[PDB]
C-alpha cells in the first residue's frame, strides 16, 4: 500500500484505488497502473522533473529502504493478475530487486523528489509506475 500526496492530488497505484477515490478523479489509466484523486488538505510531496536512473524505494515486505538502479520508463510485458489480464503496461521502469504484491504503492526518490511507485514484482524484480511526465501535477 501507499500513496504520493502532492498539492489537492493524491496518486495511488489503480487497482489498490479506493470509493472516494473514483468519486473524486482527476485522471486515470489503466495502462500506467495509475490514478489521481482530489484532496481537502495539502500535500507535501515533490515530483522530481528529472531523467535519473538511480534512487531508492520503500519494500514494505522487508520494512527497508533500497538503494537501486532502474530503466527508462517504457513499455513492458505484465503477466496476468487478479487485477489485470496479461498486456503491456505502459511508462514502467524495472529494477533488481524484492517486490511482493502488498509492496504496491511504496516510493521510489531521486535527489529531485518523487520518482514513482511500486507497481510489479517477482523473479527478483521491482517495477515502478513513472509519474515525472505528468507536469501537470505541480499545477491547479
Ligand atoms: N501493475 C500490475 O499489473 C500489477 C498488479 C498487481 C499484481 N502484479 C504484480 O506484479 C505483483 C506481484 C508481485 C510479486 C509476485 C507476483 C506478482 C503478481 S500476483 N498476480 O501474484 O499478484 C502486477
Ligand atoms: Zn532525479
Redesign the pocket.
Known amino acids: 500500500s501507499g500513496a504520493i500526496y502532492v498539492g489537492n492530488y493524491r496518486v495511488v497505484?489503480?487497482?489498490l484505488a479506493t470509493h472516494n477515490d473514483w468519486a473524486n478523479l482527476v485522471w486515470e489509466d489503466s495502462s500506467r497502473?495509475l490514478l489521481v484523486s482530489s484532496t481537502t488538505a495539502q500535500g507535501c510531496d515533490t515530483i522530481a522533473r528529472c531523467d535519473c536512473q538511480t534512487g531508492v524505494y520503500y519494500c514494505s515486505s522487508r520494512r527497508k529502504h533500497y538503494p537501486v538502479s532502474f530503466s527508462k520508463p517504457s513499455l513492458i510485458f505484465?503477466?496476468?493478475?487478479?487485477?489485470?489480464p496479461a498486456?503491456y503496461?505502459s511508462h514502467?521502469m524495472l529494477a533488481v530487486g524484492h517486490?511482493?504484491?502488498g509492496?504496491?504503492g511504496g516510493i521510489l526518490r531521486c535527489q529531485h523528489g518523487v520518482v514513482g511507485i511500486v507497481?510489479?514484482?517477482?523473479?527478483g524484480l521491482v517495477?515502478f509506475?513513472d509519474v515525472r511526465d505528468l507536469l501537470w501535477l505541480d499545477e491547479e
Open positions: 497505484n489503480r487497482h497502473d505484465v503477466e496476468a493478475s487478479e487485477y489485470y498486456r503496461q514502467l517486490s511482493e504484491p509492496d504496491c507497481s510489479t514484482g517477482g523473479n517495477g509506475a
